[PDB]
Design a protein around this ligand. Structure first.
Ligand SMILES: *[C@@H]1O[C@H](CO[C@@H]2O[C@@H](C)[C@@H](O)[C@@H](O)[C@@H]2O)[C@@H](O[C@@H]2O[C@H](CO)[C@@H](O[C@@H]3O[C@H](CO[C@H]4O[C@H](CO)[C@@H](O)[C@H](O)[C@@H]4O[C@@H]4O[C@H](CO)[C@@H](O[C@@H]5O[C@H](CO)[C@H](O)[C@H](O)[C@H]5O)[C@H](O)[C@H]4NC(C)=O)[C@@H](O)[C@H](O[C@H]4O[C@H](CO)[C@@H](O)[C@H](O)[C@@H]4O)[C@@H]3O)[C@H](O)[C@H]2NC(C)=O)[C@H](O)[C@H]1NC(C)=O
Ligand SMILES: *[C@@H]1O[C@H](CO[C@@H]2O[C@@H](C)[C@@H](O)[C@@H](O)[C@@H]2O)[C@@H](O[C@@H]2O[C@H](CO)[C@@H](O[C@@H]3O[C@H](CO[C@H]4O[C@H](CO)[C@@H](O)[C@H](O)[C@@H]4O[C@@H]4O[C@H](CO)[C@@H](O[C@@H]5O[C@H](CO)[C@H](O)[C@H](O)[C@H]5O)[C@H](O)[C@H]4NC(C)=O)[C@@H](O)[C@H](O[C@H]4O[C@H](CO)[C@@H](O)[C@H](O)[C@@H]4O)[C@@H]3O)[C@H](O)[C@H]2NC(C)=O)[C@H](O)[C@H]1NC(C)=O
Lengths: 13, 207, 206
């Protein structure tokens, strides 16, 4: 899955 | 002669795949007589050639400021590669070398906790929301606050403090109008750190 | 030529009646060939004579460090008096003067809020007890923890952070064995000039 921060891509694994 | 300062990328840039992390080699006290500077860059000893010189900037105290920017790969940095900037200039008897990288050591995951205001502060016009971040290594981190998908900018975060187990801790405090707190609004503390799952965790807090 | 650095007293020393605050004038790069250092101290421009010179120290780099210590009264420092060190030396084209005082600006009372450990941290071996100290000025402060009169030594404290209103805050964390928390009243103590008796204590228990 992935992480978002204020709608910006953080990182995915 | 000239002086050289080598700066790491921003925690956030290294940690968000949507951002571009760069290392910056700043040369100050470059003279009007010999403004020409040569940069050589090295990653773990190996010369790379993709650095870009920024526009030269007149400082008005007799000297120029000259800057070389090297883009780096997120994982390269996080894996702890060493980035060497080497500066040559006619006013320098020997080229100056500088090297930075991430602090060395086994990265450790931060535990994040939110703490509501003391009841004793419920007398004030504004109130403090606490985000405790402890047990992280290395010290490179980014903490921000939000509510309803919008950034809340009225916070301050302590510098990180080296704890007794060799990891770090910090506290971030967000100051909200008491009304905003009493009305049930949900406030979120966002932490970005290399050792978090997907470099990210969020913790929420409401009345 | 030698170089001068002027240091203030320890916040704790200015705030505890029983301790002796002092202002310290440290001259470095004092040459072997001329080690004579004349000290002239001034308090608000008025020359004082009670300064005491420390034992001269040889530094590994072939120079002398020369120190002059001036005791100050608590009320003098806290009331904003200006302390000037003037340092004369033969290896110096003209004497070097340095000045220090307390941070200028209206003092402001620290608010002291103890914050219990999060429900999330309760599933760990050691819990964090939090005491937030905010809205104080100047930043000169001391934080300690205790219990039953016995001083708990296991805590860490952030340096003061400048806040958006011009005051400072900090956090102090006392980490305790999770057993003790279910099993004692814990206290956070703050010393700061703008407190009553320059001292307050807040307590915390489950
Ligand atoms: C002529 O003037 C120049 C310019 O000076 C400016 O203008 C004059 C009028 C004055 O107002 C100055 O105050 C102005 O700065 C003089 O050049 C200065 O020389 C200083 C010493 O020679 C040098 O000191 C060293 O600074 C380091 C920290 O520098 C930071 O922070 C300061 C502000 O605090 C800032 O001014 C600097 O530019 C620098 O800022 C960082 O820049 C980097 C690179 O761009 C940033 O990193 C990047 O960020 C971007 C996004 O922004 C992106 O994310 C990139 O990926 C990332 O890499 C970073 O974010 C900026 N940080 C901040 C906080 O803003 C100190 O570390 C260093 O200390 C160390 O070395 C000392 C020895 O000297 C030791 O004693 C000490 O212990 C330390 O180890 C130095 O103090 C100044 O930085 C330099 N100023 C500039 C602007 O370059 C020049 O001296 C003068 N000549 C003469 C003859 O007088
Ligand atoms: C020959 O060597 C000497 C000595 O160097 C030492 O030995 C070598 C081999 C190494 O091991 C070094 O690490 C050793 O230091 C050189 O002398 C040095 O010169 C430096 C500059 O030339 C000078 O830098 C300045 O330091 C300031 C901070 O000083 C603090 O802290 C440092 C450690 O972090 C320490 O070195 C200092 O001694 C000093 O320590 C404080 O001392 C005061 C006075 O005793 C204490 O206050 C008292 O405390 C008592 C209780 O104990 C009591 O309560 C009293 O009430 C109270 O007054 C205080 O507790 C101590 N604090 C700490 C943390 O220890 C910097 O702030 C300063 O920066 C400023 O400079 C600029 C302005 O001009 C600005 O950039 C900036 O904004 C600052 O304002 C200086 O950089 C070193 O201190 C000095 N070292 C010593 C030991 O004196 C010498 O230069 C060299 N010769 C040659 C030719 O090179």
């Amino acid at each position: 899955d992935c992480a978002w921060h204020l709608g910006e891509l953080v990182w995915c694994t | 002669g000239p002086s050289v300062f080598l700066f790491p990328p921003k925690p956030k840039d290294t940690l968000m795949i949507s951002r571009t992390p760069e290392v910056t080699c700043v040369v100050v006290d470059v003279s009007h007589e010999d403004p020409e500077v040569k940069f050589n860059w090295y990653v773990d000893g190996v010369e790379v050639h993709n650095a870009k010189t920024k526009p030269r900037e007149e400082q008005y105290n007799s000297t120029y400021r000259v800057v070389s920017v090297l883009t780096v790969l997120h994982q390269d940095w996080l894996n702890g590669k060493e980035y060497k900037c080497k500066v040559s200039n006619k006013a320098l008897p020997a080229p100056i070398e500088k090297t930075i990288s991430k602090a060395k050591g086994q990265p450790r995951e931060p535990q994040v906790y939110t703490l509501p205001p003391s009841r004793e502060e419920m007398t004030k016009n504004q109130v403090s929301l606490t985000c405790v971040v402890k047990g992280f290594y290395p010290s490179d981190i980014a903490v921000e606050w939000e509510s309803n998908g919008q950034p809340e900018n009225n916070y301050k975060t302590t510098p990180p403090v080296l704890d007794s187990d060799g990891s770090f801790f910090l506290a971030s405090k967000l100051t909200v109008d008491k009304s905003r707190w009493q009305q049930g609004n949900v406030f979120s503390c966002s932490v970005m750190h290399e050792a978090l799952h997907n470099h990210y965790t969020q913790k929420s807090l409401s009345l």
